[PDB]
Amino acid sequence: DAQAREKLALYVYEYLLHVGAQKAAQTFLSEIRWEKNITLGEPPGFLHTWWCVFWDLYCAA
Amino acid sequence: AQAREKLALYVYEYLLHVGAQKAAQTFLSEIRWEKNITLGEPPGFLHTWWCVFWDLYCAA
Amino acid sequence: AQAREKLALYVYEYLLHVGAQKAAQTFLSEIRWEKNITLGEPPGFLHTWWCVFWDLYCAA
Amino acid sequence: DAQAREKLALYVYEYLLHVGAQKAAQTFLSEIRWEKNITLGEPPGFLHTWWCVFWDLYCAA
C-alpha cells in the first residue's frame, strides 16, 4: 500500500524529467520530502509506457 | 498523442491532491498547457489506476 | 451487474472467433440471453484485453 | 503467446461452469480438442474477478 504510493511518486518524478518539466520535478521532491534513492530509465519512462498500454485498451472498447 | 494529454491532466491532479501544489503550477507552465482544467475528489484518478496496475505488476 | 452482461457478450464473441460456434449457441440459450448481439473482427475484444492482462499477471 | 491462448481457454471453461452454462463448457472443450489438465477455483472464478477489476476501472474514467 505505502510501497505503491512511494513508487507512483518515483515514476511521476521520472515523467516530469522526460516530459521537459525539470523545475516541476525538483520542486515535487522538495514538497514530498523525498529522502530515498532515485533510479531513472529511458524516456518517456515507465508511467507513460504503462499508461499508453491501458489507454490503447481503453480506446478499443 | 491524446493519450499523452490525458496523462498530463491526471498527473497535474495527482500533484495537487498529494500536496505538491507548487510543482503542479510549475508543471502546466513548463509544458505551456493552455486547455481547460477539471479535476475530481482526492486522491485522483492517476492514484486509482496506479493501485490496480501496481498490484498487477508486483515487482519493486 | 452491467459488468457481468458485457463479459457474457465478449465470451460469446470469443467462442465464435475461436471455432467453438456450437458452445457459443448453447451458451446464449443456457443463460436465457435475450438482448441484441453485435461483434467485431476476430480474434475479439476478450482476447485483446486478455493479452495485456495476462502479460501483466505473468504466473501460470 | 500460446501459453496465453491456452490460459484464456481454461478460464473461459471455468466461467461457463460457474455461470450455469455447463453444456456449453463441455462442448467448448470438444470443439478445441483440449487434451490438458483442468484445475478449478471457486465461483465466479478468475476471469469474472479480473474482468470486474478492469470494469470498475473502466467506469471511473
Numbering used by the authors:
A (entry chain B), D (entry chain B): 13 to 73
B (entry chain A), C (entry chain A): 14 to 73
Paper lines:
The Chip/LIM-domain binding protein (LDB)–single-stranded DNA-binding protein (SSDP) (ChiLS) complex controls numerous cell-fate decisions in animal cells, by mediating transcription of developmental control genes via remote enhancers. Chip/LDB and SSDP both contain N-terminal dimerization domains that constitute the bulk of their structured cores. We recently discovered that Chip/LDB and SSDP form a stable complex called ChiLS (Chip/LDB-SSDP), which binds to NPFxD motifs within the nuclear Wnt signaling factor Pygopus (Pygo) and Osa/ARID1A, a chromatin-binding subunit of the BAF transcriptional coactivator complex. Here, we report the crystal structures of the DD of SSDP and XLdb1, in the latter case with the help of DARPin (designed ankyrin repeat proteins) chaperones that mask a hydrophobic surface patch of the DD required for its SSDP binding.
SSDP contains an N-terminal LisH domain known to form obligate dimers in other proteins, followed by a highly conserved extension and a long nonconserved C-terminal tail likely to be disordered. To determine the structure of SSDP-N, we optimized its boundaries and succeeded in obtaining crystals for SSDP1–86 that diffracted to 2.4 Å. As we were unable to use molecular replacement with the LisH domain as a search model, we generated 5 different selenomethionine (SeMet)-labeled mutants, 1 of which yielded diffracting crystals that enabled us to determine the structure of SSDP-N. The asymmetric crystallographic unit contains a classic LisH dimer-fold in which 2 α-helices (α1, α2) associate to form an antiparallel 4-helix bundle, the hydrophobic interface of which is strengthened by additional hydrogen bonds in its periphery. A third helix (α3) interacts with its counterpart (α3′) from the opposite dimer to form an X-shaped structure, tucked under the 4-helix bundle. As in other LisH dimers, the dimer interface is extensive (burying ∼2,500 Å2), which explains why SSDP forms obligate dimers, and why SSDP monomers are not detectable (see also below). Within the crystal lattice, symmetry-related dimers associate via 2 perpendicular pairs of antiparallel α3 helices. The resulting interlocked bundle of 4 α-helices bury ∼1,400 Å2, and is held together entirely via hydrophobic contacts, with valine 65 (V65) occupying a central position in the tetramer interface (“α3 interface,” below). Intriguingly, some of the hydrophobic residues in the loop between α2 and α3 also mediate association between symmetry-related dimers in the crystal, resulting in alternative tetramer configurations. We conclude that SSDP binds to Chip/LDB via its α3 surface.
